[PDB]
């Protein structure tokens, strides 16, 4: 049944709750972003109001065929009224179109639901600075001190320098980047920009990117693989067998692959700096696992929460085991005693 951490008290609303059938008493279903564990359940047969960003609404219409009459896109950073309740959508710094949702309950309680997010100090200067938040529904994906990772900027500098050096040493090398969802577009787009190429991809993936309002996108992507030396493939195909097979398909245009897998975290982060990352190599194929995250590190999460000073935290991730729940609650208490709220 629908878990409590998906329901907004004092309203008829749910967040990211499309796989439970008709949730009894729900008048408005919000969707924070277009990732499958969150939209699971939506289709052209859904007939209740969906509230979301413009970009998420484009993806609902074009990829899932949800009918337009049930899609209610909202502008960001703007006070809107939904079924009698004031709400605001804020940028979550996750994937394109991903939002956090502020709810102003009729009784005076203010609730922030982060959806999935990568906390950032810029958020301390949004509409969040303007009133107190009582209850925080928090993306706790990486809520343990072992999870450190570099800035997105550091990771993209590493990827651009590596790709440019490889292709300038060997003009017959192909660059391949893995994907299985929206998000992390800066990885492949930055590499294509330094090489003077478009990114080549499947018709399905091209359609997805064309829903994202990214400026000048017609100038950066293409379905013509032959004209491109940066190819996007499914993440599953980013292994030696999959890559050797792809190289066969290019008809001797290329003699080497350099491949990137933008993972979240991997335990090479508890030891290794970004400067010190090395690939797995077999023959003329090299694979680089790079720690490009669209979720908060532990320290980013901790800073955001100690700034916001909520009265109550409701985790939304890692909630399925008692040891994970109890560990997170211990961190929340440490943070509150350190900061004095």
**Binding residues for Ni ion (CB under 5 A):** 35, 116
CA 258 vs CA 148, 177, 225, 279, 315: distances in Å: 26, 9, 16, 9, 39
Structure tokens at 126: 């949004």
Q: How many degrees, rounded to 5, is the angle at CA 123 between CA 129 and CA 73?
A: 95
In the complex, the smallest distance separating the C-beta of residue 15 from Ni ion, rounded to whole angstroms, is 13
In the complex, the smallest distance separating the C-beta of residue 35 from Ni ion, rounded to whole angstroms, is 4
Q: Which is nearer to Ni ion, 116 or 185 (CB)?
A: 116
Q: Is the dihedral of CA 35, 39, 45, 51 positive or negative?
A: negative
Q: Which is nearer to Ni ion, 96 or 289 (CB)?
A: 96
Q: Which is nearer to Ni ion, 231 or 295 (CB)?
A: 295
CA 269 vs CA 61, 122, 156, 253, 275: distances in Å: 39, 25, 16, 36, 12
SS3 content of the chain, % helix, strand, coil (to 5): 35, 20, 45
Please choose, from the candidates 56, 90, 51, the residue with its C-alpha nearest in 3D space to the C-alpha of residue 71. Answer: 51
In the complex, the smallest distance separating the C-beta of residue 317 from Ni ion, rounded to whole angstroms, is 10
Backbone angles phi, psi at 64, to 5 degrees: -105, -10
For residues 300 and 149, is the Cβ–Cβ distance under 8 A?
Answer: no
Q: Which is nearer to Ni ion, 158 or 304 (CB)?
A: 304
Chain mean position to CA 287: 22
In the complex, the smallest distance separating the C-beta of residue 57 from Ni ion, rounded to whole angstroms, is 17
Contacts of 299 (CB under 8 A, 6+ apart): 148
In the complex, the smallest distance separating the C-beta of residue 275 from Ni ion, rounded to whole angstroms, is 28
Q: Which is nearer to Ni ion, 35 or 261 (CB)?
A: 35
Q: Which is nearer to Ni ion, 95 or 243 (CB)?
A: 95
Element (H, E) at 179: strand 173-179
In the complex, the smallest distance separating the C-beta of residue 159 from Ni ion, rounded to whole angstroms, is 21
For residues 209 and 200, is the Cβ–Cβ distance under 8 A?
Answer: no
Q: Which is nearer to Ni ion, 38 or 198 (CB)?
A: 38
In the complex, the smallest distance separating the C-beta of residue 33 from Ni ion, rounded to whole angstroms, is 6
In the complex, the smallest distance separating the C-beta of residue 93 from Ni ion, rounded to whole angstroms, is 12
Q: Which is nearer to Ni ion, 183 or 242 (CB)?
A: 183
């Amino acid at each position: 049944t629908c878990p409590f951490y998906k329901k907004i008290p004092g309203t008829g609303f749910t967040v990211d709750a499309f796989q439970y059938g008709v949730v009894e008493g729900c008048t408005a279903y919000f969707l924070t972003h277009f990732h499958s564990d969150h939209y699971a359940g939506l289709s052209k047969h859904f007939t209740f109001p969906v509230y979301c960003s413009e970009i998420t609404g484009n993806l609902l219409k074009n990829k899932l065929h949800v009918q337009e009459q049930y899609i209610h896109p909202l502008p960001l950073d703007t006070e809107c009224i939904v079924n009698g309740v004031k709400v605001v959508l804020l940028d979550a710094n996750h994937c394109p179109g991903a939002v956090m949702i502020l709810f102003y309950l009729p009784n005076g309680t203010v609730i922030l639901h982060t959806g999935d997010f990568r906390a950032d100090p810029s958020m301390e200067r949004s509409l969040l600075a303007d009133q107190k938040v009582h209850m925080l529904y928090l993306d706790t994906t990486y809520c343990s001190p072992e999870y450190t990772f570099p800035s997105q900027q550091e990771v993209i500098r590493f990827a651009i320098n590596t790709a440019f050096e490889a292709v300038t040493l060997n003009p017959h090398a192909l660059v391949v980047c893995g994907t299985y969802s929206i998000g992390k577009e800066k990885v492949f787009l930055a590499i294509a920009d330094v090489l003077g190429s478009k990114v080549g991809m499947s018709q399905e993936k091209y359609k997805t990117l064309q829903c994202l309002n990214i400026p000048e996108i017609n100038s950066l992507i293409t379905t013509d693989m032959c004209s491109s030396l940066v190819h996007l493939l499914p993440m599953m195909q980013i292994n030696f067998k999959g890559l050797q097979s792809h190289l066969k398909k290019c008809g001797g245009k290329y003699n080497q692959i350099l491949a990137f897998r933008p993972t979240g975290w991997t335990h090479s982060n508890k030891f290794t700096r970004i400067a010190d990352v090395i690939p797995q190599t077999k023959g003329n194929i090299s694979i680089y696992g790079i720690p490009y995250s669209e979720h908060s590190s532990y320290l980013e999460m901790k800073r955001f929460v100690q700034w916001l000073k909520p009265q109550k935290i409701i985790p939304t991730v890692n909630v399925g085991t008692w040891k994970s729940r109890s560990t997170m609650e211990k961190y929340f208490r440490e943070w509150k005693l350190e900061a004095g709220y």
